[PDB]
Symmetry: D3
Subunit: 51 residues, 6 copies
């Protein structure tokens, strides 16, 4: 019906909210790890150089 | 040490959000499962009272 | 004052936000009953028809 | 079981929303009750000072 | 580098909206403490006048 | 007394909000902290490469 339909379009949209905020957390996480990897990679470049 | 506390806090927060998205799917799916039983139960009724 | 009538607005908007979320939680829970109750009734009909009543 | 455990999860989240709406109404009521007796006191000061 | 910068702003937005809520709560605690102090001011005035 | 716990329940919610605002700044800080160390390291690689 109509009262039922408007409940599905909210429950679906409320879901992708939680599925969006989980992606934004994933965005922060493996962007920290990306900077972590560049840091080690640049550190080892420096080390291999002075060696 | 202090870097991998925030890192643990984020993943714990990320998982907390993931469960919410899954809790919504089980409610949105169990709804869809129940109406499917209606359409399949009401059809049984119609077929049955077509026979008499 | 006016700040005191800006905070009352913020509260009564915050409050109506909470009342609405509790209402949405009901219709989901209420509809999950009207559908579950309908299936017992629909099942009780399929039975009553096969028995020939 | 799958269906009736999520119903708990739903009811517990509903009351977790009602409890919030009650906590807000408690602030809005108690902050008006304060505002009320202040006028009720402000009048006694005026009534007393007039005689 | 660029998708990164949309995340920095999202983190900044959530930070401000958290500071806004911390300030909004402060006004709730401040107006309450302001009101009970006006009571004691008005209540003790009535008492002085009543003597 | 009924007034009392509300003021603590309200102050506690203020602390929960203050804490979240701090945690967001950490991520903003340690992010900007890492991108600074990564530029500083990148400069060392340039200077040393001669």
């Amino acid at each position: 019906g109509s009262e039922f339909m408007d409940m599905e379009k909210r429950l679906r949209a409320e879901m992708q909210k939680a599925e969006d905020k989980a992606v934004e957390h994933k965005e922060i996480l493996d962007q920290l790890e990306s900077l972590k990897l560049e840091n080690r990679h640049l550190s080892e470049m420096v080390m291999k150089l002075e060696l």
